[PDB]
């Protein structure tokens, strides 16, 4: 998430995002993953406590 903005071009005269430069959605058939260290998210199973 948020990887798309790294794709977008930049206009230094206005400090505004442009159109995409990089393809933010392209994987080249590779399956490089990234460990999201904040993955922890509390859940409560009422049936189990």
């Amino acid at each position: 998430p948020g990887s798309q903005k790294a794709a977008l071009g930049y206009n230094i005269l206005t400090q505004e995002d442009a159109q995409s430069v990089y393809d933010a959605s392209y994987y080249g058939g590779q399956c490089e993953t990234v460990y999201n260290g904040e993955w922890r998210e509390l859940r409560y199973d009422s049936t189990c406590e």
Binding site: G37, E38, W39, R40
Partner: protein
């Protein structure tokens, strides 16, 4: 609060920083098992580094 220090140290298990490091220079990975002219590449890396 001691509570928030407990919560922080709990969450460091899952997303720790690297406090101490012992490192070897990357040329030590350059090994004939993988690369032709391994010695030459190795030496080039030493010089370049």
């Amino acid at each position: 609060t001691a509570d928030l220090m407990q919560e922080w140290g709990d969450a460091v298990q899952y997303n720790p920083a690297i406090i101490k490091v012992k490192v070897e220079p990357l040329y030590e990975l350059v090994t004939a098992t993988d690369f032709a002219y391994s010695s030459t590449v190795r030496q080039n890396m030493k010089q370049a580094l």
